[PDB]
Structure formats: C-alpha cells, structure tokens
C-alpha cells in the first residue's frame, strides 16, 4: 500500500493532495492517506515526526505536501513525481 501524507482539503486546501489520491484510485493502487492536520489548528505531532524522520529533515519549514512513499518504502516525493512513476 502506498503512504500519502497530506491535507484533507476540507480542513486545508491541498489540490495536489487530492490529485495524488485520484491518480492512485485510477491505477487501482491501494494507499493509506495520513492527515498531518486532523483539525483546523492542530498538527498531528506524531505523524509529522514520522514523516520528517523518513525524509531526514530537521524541520517542517520548507516541507511540501503531499509526500508519497512507495509500497516498498521508497520516497517518491510529490504529485509530479507520482505521475512520472506510473509512466
């Protein structure tokens, strides 16, 4: 299953997060979507710590959403990278 980190656009607009879920649904590629801000004004500290650790980053400043990981665990990156991965 792919791992997609991002925003629920109903809480915080992220059109690239939605494009990423639509693409995986078109390819019938099973995925788990991880919402790093489950409520307006509350970050899920545990899943951001998880993400930054996998990306080897000391800070969320600069982080771009969505961030997608392959079923094998490899970091793919953003939406354009995901699109390119299926080509």
* One-character DSSP codes across 47-62: HHHHHHHHHT-S-STT
Question: This structure's resolution (angstroms)?
Answer: 2.0
Nearest residue to 86 via CA among 35, 33, 28: 28
Domain range annotation of the chain:
1-87
The contacts of residue 23 (CB under 8 Å, 6+ apart) are 79, 82, 83, 86
Query: What is the second-level CATH architecture of the domain 1-87?
Result: 3-Layer(aba) Sandwich (3.40)
Asked whether the CA dihedral 57, 60, 64, 67 is positive or negative, the reply is positive
Give the technique used to solve this structure: X-ray
CA end-to-end span of the chain: 19
d(CA 83, CA 87): 7
């Amino acid at each position: 299953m792919f791992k997609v980190y991002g925003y629920d656009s109903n809480i915080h607009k992220c059109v690239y997060c939605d494009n990423a879920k639509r693409l995986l649904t078109v390819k019938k590629q099973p995925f788990e979507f991880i919402n790093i801000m489950p409520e307006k004004g509350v970050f899920d500290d545990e899943k951001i710590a998880e993400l930054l650790t996998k990306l080897g980053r000391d800070t969320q400043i600069g982080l771009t959403m969505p961030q997608v990981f392959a079923p094998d665990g490899s970091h793919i990156g953003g939406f354009d990278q995901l699109r390119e991965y299926f080509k």
